[PDB]
Amino acid sequence: ESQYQVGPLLGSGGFGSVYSGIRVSDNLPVAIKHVEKDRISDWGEVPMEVVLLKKVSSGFSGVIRLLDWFERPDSFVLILERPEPVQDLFDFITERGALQEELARSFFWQVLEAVRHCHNCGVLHRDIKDENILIDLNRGELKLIDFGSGALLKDTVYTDFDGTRVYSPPEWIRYHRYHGRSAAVWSLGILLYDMVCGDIPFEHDEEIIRGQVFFRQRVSSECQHLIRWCLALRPSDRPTFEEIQNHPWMQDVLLPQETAEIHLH
Numbered sequence: 665e666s667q668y669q670v671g672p673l674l675g676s677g678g679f680g681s682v683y684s685g686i687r688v689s690d691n692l693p694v695a696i697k698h699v700e701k702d703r704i705s706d707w708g709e710v711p712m713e714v715v716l717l718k719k720v721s722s723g724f725s726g727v728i729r730l731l732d733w734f735e736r737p738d739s740f741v742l743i744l745e746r747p748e749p750v751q752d753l754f755d756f757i758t759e760r761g762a763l764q765e766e767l768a769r770s771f772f773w774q775v776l777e778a779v780r781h782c783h784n785c786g787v788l789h790r791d792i793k794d795e796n797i798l799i800d801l802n803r804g805e806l807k808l809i810d811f812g813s814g815a816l817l818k819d820t821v822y823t824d825f826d827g828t829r830v831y832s833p834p835e836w837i838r839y840h841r842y843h844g845r846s847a848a849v850w851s852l853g854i855l856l857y858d859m860v861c862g863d864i865p866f867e868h869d870e871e872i873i874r875g876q877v878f879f880r881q882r883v884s885s886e887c888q889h890l891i892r893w894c895l896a897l898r899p900s901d902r903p904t905f906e907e908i909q910n911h912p913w914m915q916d917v918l919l920p921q922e923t924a925e926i927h928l929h
């Protein structure tokens with residue numbers, strides 16, 4: 665209360681309410697996110713989201729870092745990093761339409777680096793999508809947000825999910841079972857299609873199940889191939905992170921600052 669000055673509401677939804685703010689001591693820009701305890705589904709040791717953020721908030725990353733948190737009688741309050749100026753990937757794509765492949769290559773690469781960092785830290789995000797990706801527009805750097813539906817990463821089967829359905833894999837739709845990495849890779853396929861086409865490939869359960877990809881925009885063969893690989897119906901047929909980043913479409917990525925200079929300035 666006295667440590668932060670609160671500004672505008674930035675967003676609200678299933679994750680709670682997120683406000684802009686300034687840390688009073690040093691003027692550091694922050695985001696202040698409130699969520700009601702009753703609206704919290706999962707807990708650890710605090711909300712699971714706090715556990716997962718601390719595991720990935722150490723060191724530098726393509727993840728929005730947790731700086732502090734507070735418990736109130738009926739809510740938890742998270743103090744998060746806030747780049748300025750910033751825009752989420754959903755609003756960016758909405759404003760600009762399908763992204764040029766060079767731009768999509770750079771963004772997608774940074775998303776992959778961030779997700780690998782989560783996985784190395786023992787964290788599975790479970791809601792990778794355009795709305796959960798922030799763009800620092802000056803540095804051309806991408807940051808993941810919203811670990812509110814994530815879990816500790818494990819090698820056994822998940823039978824629960826509360827992420828975004830249209831990014832969820834066919835095995836979740838049919839069987840209510842998935843494994844972490846291969847489900848992550850599927851959502852990455854949806855994300856990459858979204859970047860180069862300006863919209864998601866599937867809307868209904870049976871389209872996800874059928875897994876046929878139609879391209880509504882001109883997209884290179886190499887990119888279509890990577891997308892179709894990530895969206896293989898058999899989880900085991902999907903690429904590993906390593907195979908994604910060694911894919912020919914992923915070669916010669918721009919540096920983030922180059923990306924900002926060319927595409928964001």
Ligand SMILES: NCCCNc1nc(-c2ccccc2O)nc2ccccc12
Nearest residue numbers: 674675679682695745746752795809810
């Ligand atoms: N797509 C909704 C995004 C609303 N804005 C923002 N949302 C969040 C945010 C939203 C949900 C969960 C955790 C989070 O950190 N964190 C932000 C951090 C800095 C700047 C903006 C932010």
